Design a protein around this motif. Sequence first.
Motif, short mmCIF file in Angstrom:
data_model
loop_
_atom_site.label_atom_id
_atom_site.label_comp_id
_atom_site.label_asym_id
_atom_site.label_seq_id
_atom_site.Cartn_x
_atom_site.Cartn_y
_atom_site.Cartn_z
N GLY A 21 -25.20 38.93 8.68
CA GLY A 21 -24.33 39.65 7.76
C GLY A 21 -23.21 38.78 7.23
N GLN A 24 -24.71 36.47 4.64
CA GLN A 24 -24.95 37.22 3.41
C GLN A 24 -23.65 37.48 2.66
OE1 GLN A 24 -24.65 40.99 3.00
NE2 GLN A 24 -25.77 41.12 1.06
N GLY A 25 -22.61 37.91 3.38
CA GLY A 25 -21.32 38.14 2.75
C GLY A 25 -20.74 36.87 2.16
N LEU A 28 -22.78 36.11 -1.12
CA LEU A 28 -22.41 37.03 -2.18
C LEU A 28 -20.98 36.81 -2.65
CD1 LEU A 28 -25.04 38.44 -0.89
CD2 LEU A 28 -23.99 40.55 -1.66
N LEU A 29 -20.06 36.52 -1.73
CA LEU A 29 -18.68 36.27 -2.14
C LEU A 29 -18.54 34.96 -2.89
CD1 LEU A 29 -16.33 37.58 0.70
CD2 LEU A 29 -16.83 38.53 -1.55
N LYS A 32 -19.71 35.81 -6.34
CA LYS A 32 -18.66 36.56 -7.02
C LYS A 32 -17.54 35.63 -7.47
CE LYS A 32 -15.70 40.59 -6.34
NZ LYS A 32 -15.06 41.46 -5.32
N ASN A 97 -13.44 47.16 -16.51
CA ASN A 97 -14.12 46.55 -15.37
C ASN A 97 -14.82 45.29 -15.86
N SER A 99 -16.57 41.93 -14.92
CA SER A 99 -17.32 41.33 -13.81
C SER A 99 -17.11 42.21 -12.58
CB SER A 99 -16.92 39.87 -13.65
N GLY A 100 -16.78 41.65 -11.41
CA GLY A 100 -16.56 42.47 -10.24
C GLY A 100 -15.22 43.17 -10.22
N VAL A 101 -14.19 42.55 -10.80
CA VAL A 101 -12.83 43.08 -10.74
C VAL A 101 -12.64 44.16 -11.80
N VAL C 73 -24.00 45.88 1.28
CA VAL C 73 -23.38 45.08 0.22
C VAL C 73 -21.96 45.57 -0.06
CG1 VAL C 73 -23.49 44.55 -2.23
CG2 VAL C 73 -25.53 44.30 -0.81
N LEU C 76 -19.69 44.29 2.45
CA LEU C 76 -19.46 42.87 2.20
C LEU C 76 -18.46 42.63 1.07
N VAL C 77 -18.57 43.38 -0.03
CA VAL C 77 -17.93 42.99 -1.28
C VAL C 77 -16.97 44.05 -1.81
N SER C 80 -16.20 47.08 -5.48
CA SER C 80 -15.39 47.12 -6.68
C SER C 80 -16.23 47.44 -7.91
CB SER C 80 -14.65 45.79 -6.86
N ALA C 81 -17.33 46.72 -8.09
CA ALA C 81 -18.21 46.89 -9.25
C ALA C 81 -19.55 47.41 -8.75
CB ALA C 81 -18.38 45.57 -10.01
#
Lengths: 214, 189, 188, 111
Positions: A21, A24-25, A28-29, A32, A97, A99-101, C73, C76-77, C80-81
């Motif tokens: 985990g 994976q985090g 992914l981070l 991002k 919104n 991207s992710g933020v 997920v 993890l993240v 937010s989106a």
Amino acid sequence: NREQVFPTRMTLGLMKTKLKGANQGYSLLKRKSEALTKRFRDITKRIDDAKQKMGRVMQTAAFSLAEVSYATGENIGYQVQESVSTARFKVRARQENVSGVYLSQFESYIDPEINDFRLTGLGRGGQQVQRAKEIYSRAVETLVELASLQTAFIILDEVIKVTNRRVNAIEHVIIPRTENTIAYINSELDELDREEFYRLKKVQEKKQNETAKL
Amino acid sequence: PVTTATLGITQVFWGLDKKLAQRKHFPSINTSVSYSKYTNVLNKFYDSNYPEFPVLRDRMKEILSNAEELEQVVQLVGKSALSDSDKITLDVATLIKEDFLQQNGYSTYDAFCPIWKTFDMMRAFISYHDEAQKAVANGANWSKLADSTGDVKHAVSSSKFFEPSRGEKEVHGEFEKLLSTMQERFAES
Amino acid sequence: PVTTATLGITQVFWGLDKKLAQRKHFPSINTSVSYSKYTNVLNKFYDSNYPEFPVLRDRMKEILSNAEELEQVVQLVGKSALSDSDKITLDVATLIKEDFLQQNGYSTYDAFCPIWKTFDMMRAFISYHDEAQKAVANGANWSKLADSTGDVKHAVSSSKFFEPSRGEKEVHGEFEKLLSTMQERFAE
Amino acid sequence: AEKRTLIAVIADEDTTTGLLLAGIGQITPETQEKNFFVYQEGKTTKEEITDKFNHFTEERDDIAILLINQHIAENIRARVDSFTNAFPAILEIPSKDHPYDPEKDSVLKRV
């Protein structure tokens, strides 16, 4: 250098799941952070372009205001200050919104309740005053867009900073500590298995000696 | 198994950490895991001789635990988000770990730190922490406050070198002046 | 080793979920680890009595698995989106976990959920998920749609309270009415 | 936030007049506060300008976008640097006869 977890067969599996985990985090981070950084360079380029455009528009608006003041024959600053009961232009924040933020982007609006300007009582140059007001409104809209982009830049910078901090923290603490805990738990399980093997070997040797005696 | 059985039977556990054994942080006592079950039964002796000693050790334990938690936070999320009180806690706990808790066993001054010198040192460190907390709660910025009171901080950090051979009275006189020189400097800043 | 041998020799295995047991979610049955190898042979009974039941349970398992991946997920993240469909799956599976899988064995209503009532509840939950997905695919914002259809969500969440003592006809009749208002209330 | 809906102008007299004509600023009668306060180098002082900027940034929660002249921001450079909060935004709009300096921009310095 490792988590103080009591070794166990279930604990080893739980810590391997935690390591998976964390990996994976971390991946992914990092993805991002990369996407947000690409958007960040895009936003910085947009900020530079908007700063240049805002400087040009401010110069043009200053020239128009000077021409309007010259046509009127007096400074309209006192009249504008007197007629400042309410603002005709207002800005409402919008949480776009990107991207992710979810960095907020300001949205301008016009209120017609006090939309009347200081054209009345200015003496002369009403057309020049109206043109200067229109130019100032256009420059205010451009500055509002620039300020919205600036706030998005600041928020995105903060989010990128915290995301990269979390990525480095994971990859340099969480992954190494979890890997060391995995190694230590596996070593302790191997030691316990060796102890059990030695105990069973003593039992087997005793049984063989008893059978030989009998 | 020997360690577990000994921990089961004994009452005082002076757990040593090799992380503090390295970097010459001696004694390397691990404050987190170490314990002493005679703390409560020593209250009679402490009330007889040094009444505030258990309160001071409880305050030192609280400071060290708070700093351990804050450092566990900081190693992951940086030290920028901390409040001024957390900054004071970390700074004074580093001071405690580097001056009070760490005692060089082969130096003349810290070969034998008797109970009265230890009590005075706890008084100095806890009073320094309390003065910093109070002065920041009054509104002072911690960075400028530390820059101003570096003299008091170094005086506290140099309390180790007070030779116990000077005597109980002479050493206590040096520690009494230390506290007086501490309040005035913090009052001035 | 006893559990491993039992897994080797058995045909069904209901797995204890430590996470669900710590939240006092009963029954604490792990959906990922559990299994039942009798679904293939019980397909005949399902086709005879409740024809759409196996499709519905495969849909429910798909929803739960997708929500498990999305929840990993999210942990993890920070979530937010999140896509609108992903939020629908998370909300629907949280509802499913809270209402359908969870039941009070000591409660009078949910002491024994019969097979027909369970099938009707599955119809309700899967229809709610499909209707929400279709409505959002039509372009509706999920936040406003959920604010409007909180009544429908509460209806399906409270469908577990339907007393099975009322009989198959009465319970299934009310579920059909509940399913009827699903399409009407999701028009807005 | 949604509460912050206003435009703050602390630029020179000509820029303040232009903003008022455009409708950027307003003077609340009930609150006895003006969103756009006219201030120049001669008018008031550097400390007064810094105090007004701090009040607009923090006390005036309704202000969302702040427009400060480059000449005005030159004397309030320390306050601009200290105002690292995203909201409200700070913009260094050039004043009359004072071209905008990219170096003097607070956000451009962070780049």
